[PDB]
């Protein structure tokens, strides 16, 4: 059983420079986390990233054709993307959005989400565990 | 720690109707899963339900004296009142908003939360499960 | 078969202070009238009054329960509250929403209602005789 | 001893289409169901429909010009028509606006009425029963 | 079977602008260019233009009551009318709305309408060949 | 040297109700006393009422063709039709926007005019005297 | 008796650039304008230009002082100044707003006076004739 | 001569957290301070304190039935309480608003009240004071 | 200790006009008044007026050089002035913000103020004795 | 000769997903549909589709490059992407909006396009059919 | 070649407080920094500042009558002045906007002006040094 | 000091289309202007375009790790795009934004900038040489 974990822009750059506001676990540290929750419950974990919205579609596209389960920080593009919302509208099997942070105390733009309104649920704001609470949930389907 | 389960109006009548929204779960039920759950994670939780605001922010009163974290599920509160904010205000413990159903894909009044912005995080749609997913993150801050 | 009718806060003081806008009978006489145009129609009409917003919550909840009728002036309540509006939401058999005044004649926050649109219908600014003409819509389901 | 009931664009075609919403019954069928009623009141009814707003003004105005109440359904109009309005602030005797449906819960411009700041009250969604309830407050006035 | 054109007020007029926005064409030239481009596709265009919405009404009437498609350019009713779109929603055969201008390249009042959600379709700023597309599409039903 | 003074719905009752925002002058009296101005100015009035939007469009699609000059005082399409907007639209002579009453000081409705904007200049609040200040305007031009 | 013509700031410099839009006239020659006319009309005009709404404010208290009329042109004040309102709303004798040019056809932001609702009336896009217009309203009362 | 200090929820913790923006004071002392001037204004003052709307309620009814006046300080329900607003109307002595933090350099939210256009009038952001300058003014009527 | 009682445009006006709303004080009588109350206090009060901002500005800047306190009532530039506001920020002593009326019961846009998210407090339609409460805050800092 | 044919995210996918919309078509089959469409109107269609926004953005500037057409079906981007917009109004031939489904009937956000204020013609709505519409406009404009 | 350098109000009181973004440099200092790299630019500089918005229009009028450049920081006035806009418009030479802080890092009312529309262009943010770079680009015409 | 200098989308196409909206130069030539311009200043430039977001991305990421400054031009992206204002926010070198056009002069939507509330400063519509002076300001520090 697979879940795919797809992060969006800039999430390459976790605990690199800034904040803080995201923790400093690095992108690698939290791969490794993600896959050592997923073997504890069970399931295998894909987890993946790109800056390109193009990519995260194809990635969202393969989810789809193989009925299989995602947990998404779309990052920036939550609050822009038609295109990304209408890929993930074809998945069959869960939604989770995930955010790092708590999006609802910040600038009122990270307010809008086109993924909530279709996802299965949203976590927001409980740090990198966030991730791994979604998968929890997905291990119960 | 001990932690406190607040369930706000309404939530007493669960899983009696619109199973597929709310769950068919009922809140004895409920108080038994958290309590076992709560267990499992080696804290105490305190889980109350009441349809009254004096109640609910007296409750929340005695959390931040005790400073003891709250996960709270505010129901129809979520979306109107200021005295329940400004109550969980005070808590220096975390607070952990919860939501059964996804609010984001309901009525528009439903995305508004006055508690968003000052929760530690939240949780939606991922049914009574999201409950023990805010356990679980309480078990480590 | 029993029609519940339900006053929310300071229709008690009802009487006293201008008439014109709520007219000059009391309570006490308002539930008189209205069991005697229920018994006159087949039904019987019990009839309560309450400031609490907990209390409304519980009458709706004993008539959900009961699968009984309500015909309900929420006072102030009708505006801005969420919670009450669910427990409304619970009720299978009709409800009727109703004011005295014409509250689109009157500040502009009285013109939105949380009630509106999970009610069967609505009555509007046709005095106390409002409730009696709902009775009679009961009368003939 | 005379009460108006005008009817607006589209009335003529009481389904014709529709169930929950709109009637079951004919125009025909309403005219004379009103007129049963207003008989049984001691009231002579004068029921008249019209897809012109033109027409509709000048029904108002004899009504305006004789001192007679008024029970409208303008259709479409309710939500557009400014004429429509001046012309009833004419009215000296009473102004009953009537829906069929209830307005308040379907698409978000039926919720707009430059009638209902008017009016001496406000019927909505009760069906067909509507225009009975407004013959017998009338009765009462 | 047979197409119903309908066109609104000041359509008459086509042909005292010139240039850009509706071009050279008049009414007349328009009925006969869509009259043969129809026989030619094998269908009969009913080709009608009114100042009046109750006339408007009255021919949609119909067409719902023949079970006909209509191809309509409201004009100024486009943005104003609810009374038009109820008796547009009754047809059961296709409609097509129609703008010879660009709509949304001019006024922001003009960018909204009325008939769009419930129509088939909606062809805009194709001039004079917008209404021939459009039997061309009804060719395939 | 004729000039076209054109009176939309329920002007035709002037005089009546409210004579101090419209005055105590009925239409037929308005008439006398524009017609008597333009004979002293050396022009000639024609002065027309309609409680019909078609019939309005027609008389402006009269003096579109004529190239004769508009004083317009459309009452309550001022603040609804873009029907009657586009139809003025069409004048090449100048086009005079009247209101007896102070709009501005009115209803918030009462604010907006699809007229205004195409119009050579607007006049409001000055009484029936609003008219003849029109007239002399176009005199001196 | 005295009327008083204030204009606001720019205005000083009619005459040069445009029109239409403002004058071809310069102020000195509408100052001789409006002098001539009033004359001839049994009133004395007083005129005055200042860009100091301190100076403007002061002239508006002498004419409440005199309980004199006021004709205003109050150039970018008339969209922003509360304190301009203030005044004037001291006026116990007339006061009508002139715009040279139509505030309706250009800019959003012009379309908005603090002014209309306190004046009797408006007078606007009569180019410098809108200023004889406002005498002439006077000269009647 | 008996004044009435009515505290909304939340404010019998003050004190206790966050010192900076509410008193430093307790509500005790704050009892204490307010019966101290009371007296030395020559007055009666009534302090009571409630997390209940219903029990506030029922404190402005007694008021009103004293014709004694209020001094009130809602908190939270400052924002959202229609019910207690219409309780408010009711009275007849003064009706004094007071906060202790400055509302309009707060959350936007802070910024609106529904208890501000019925009051005689509102002290902000002057502190425990406020109370205190608010029973000067009642010693004055 | 000094403190800077500034009164703005067209406040040299108070007690002759809507003496209801402002009252029956004359600016004189209204200097004398704070004046007195200030030796009561123990402070000087120099209090000024001007229509003009500059000289309004002028005033301020000097009470921030002088770090002297000031209770402003800035009449209508209260809604409309970024400098004021910016000007007042300089403040390092405690700035209060009066208005005679009750700026929330009145025109929808005298509820908007650049001062009071500023202010170190408000008070609002406690008529002149609100000057005199500005002071006596200031009598403790 | 060369018209262009655009598909922005997600129409590779075409015919598989939700039929009723969209269609039961694949991508494949509709390029075959539309070169034949195209050939037989004498004109050499080049169909080409691609989820990537830098990649449309490409095809867009050789078009521009070469004075072809573009009939343009962008998907999510055609309510997000300014840039796109930029690219297309950069063209000097024809730009046609296409949308398989009727975007008026569906979420609100669906209802704004970046691309229709600057597109000479928008046919929605119409299915599959839609581009050969728009590649017979182009064969005759 | 001449070049205006216009600071409106409280910028006399540059270089007092803070730091950012204002920052350091009195008035004194930067007009002899203009002057300056003005004569090192090969220009001459003419720096004015004033708290009066008439005192301010008087100086734009003149760099109007002698076609001069404007570099233009209007403090306050740059939000709020449509005075202050109209007399900038008969600029014939070019009109470059500068505010030493950057305006869309702050209060959202900052971010409007009056003024950017009808700029040449606008720099912001860049500190004092945002004179210096505009006399730049006025230097290369 | 290396500073780069990144270009969004369609910048490749400047200097051919629409001069001078935005084109009289090349991208080539302007690559050829800001080099010799920095060279001059004793800086080194990086001049690079893409009309890909995460290829601009990628650009942004390497100047966050080199920690050197950048001058922005995002194109369309400065509208719409969250990722991007995401990645500038790492930067610890100023970030300057820049377009050539005024911004502020055009479609309302180009009005607003994800960019300006984080960037250092901003220039508009000082064309091409915009750039320079961002490079010059750099130059300072
Ligand atoms: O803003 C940065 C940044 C981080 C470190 C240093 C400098 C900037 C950044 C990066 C990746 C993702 C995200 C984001 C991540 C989120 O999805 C989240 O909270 O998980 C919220 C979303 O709105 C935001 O774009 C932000
Ligand atoms: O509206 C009902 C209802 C219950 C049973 C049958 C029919 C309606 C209801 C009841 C309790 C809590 C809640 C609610 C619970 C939520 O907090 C939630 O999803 O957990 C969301 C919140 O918006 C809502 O008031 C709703
Ligand atoms: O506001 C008063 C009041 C009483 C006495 C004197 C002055 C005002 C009051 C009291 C009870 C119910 C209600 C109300 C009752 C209504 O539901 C109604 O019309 O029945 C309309 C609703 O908007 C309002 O809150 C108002
Ligand atoms: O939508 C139709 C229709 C039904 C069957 C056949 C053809 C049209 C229709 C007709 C008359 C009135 C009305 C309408 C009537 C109402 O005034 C009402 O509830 O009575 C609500 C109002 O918003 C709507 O326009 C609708
Ligand atoms: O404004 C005129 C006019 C006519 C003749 C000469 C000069 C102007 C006019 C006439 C008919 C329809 C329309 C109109 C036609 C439209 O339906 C259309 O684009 O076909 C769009 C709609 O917004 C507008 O009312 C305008
Ligand atoms: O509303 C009435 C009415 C008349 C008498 C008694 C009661 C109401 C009415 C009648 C004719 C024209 C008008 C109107 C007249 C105006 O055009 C006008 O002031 O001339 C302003 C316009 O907004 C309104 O439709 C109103
Ligand atoms: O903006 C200019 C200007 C003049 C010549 C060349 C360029 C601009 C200007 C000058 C005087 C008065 C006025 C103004 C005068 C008006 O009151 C009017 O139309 O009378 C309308 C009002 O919105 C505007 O501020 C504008
Ligand atoms: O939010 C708190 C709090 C207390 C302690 C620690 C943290 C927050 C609180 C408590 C009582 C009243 C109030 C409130 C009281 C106010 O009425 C006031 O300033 O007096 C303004 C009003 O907006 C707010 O709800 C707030
Ligand atoms: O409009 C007059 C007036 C004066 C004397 C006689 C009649 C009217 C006026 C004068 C000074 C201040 C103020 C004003 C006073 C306020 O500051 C206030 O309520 O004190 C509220 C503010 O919005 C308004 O501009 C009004
Ligand atoms: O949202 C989906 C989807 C379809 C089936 C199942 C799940 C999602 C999707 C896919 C491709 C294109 C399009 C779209 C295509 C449209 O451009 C169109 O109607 O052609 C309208 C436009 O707003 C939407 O983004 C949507
Ligand atoms: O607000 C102050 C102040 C000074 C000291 C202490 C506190 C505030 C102030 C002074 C001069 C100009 C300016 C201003 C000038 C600006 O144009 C600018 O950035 O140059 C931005 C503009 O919005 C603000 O009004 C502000
Ligand atoms: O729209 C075109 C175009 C290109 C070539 C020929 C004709 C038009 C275009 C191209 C590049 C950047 C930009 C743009 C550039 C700006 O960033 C700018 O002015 O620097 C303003 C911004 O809102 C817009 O996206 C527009």
């Not at 506001?21 to 990233?49: F, M, S």
């Not at 609802?104 to 809008?112: G, N, Q, S, V, W």
Request: charged residues 20%; negative net charge.
């Amino acid at each position: 059983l697979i879940v795919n974990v797809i992060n969006g822009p800039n999430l390459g750059r976790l605990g690199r420079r800034e904040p803080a506001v995201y923790g400093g676990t690095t992108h690698d540290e939290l791969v490794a986390l993600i896959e050592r929750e997923a073997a504890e419950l069970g399931l295998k974990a894909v987890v993946r990233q790109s800056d390109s919205e193009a990519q995260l579609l194809d990635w969202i596209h393969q989810a789809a054709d193989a009925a299989e389960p995602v947990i998404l920080n779309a990052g920036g593009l939550t609050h822009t993307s038609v295109a990304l919302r209408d890929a993930c509208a074809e998945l069959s099997a869960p939604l989770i959005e995930v955010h790092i942070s708590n999006v609802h105390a910040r600038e009122e733009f990270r307010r809008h989400s086109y993924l909530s309104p279709i996802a299965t649920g949203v976590i927001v704001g409980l740090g990198i565990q966030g991730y791994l609470l979604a998968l929890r949930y997905l291990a119960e389907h």
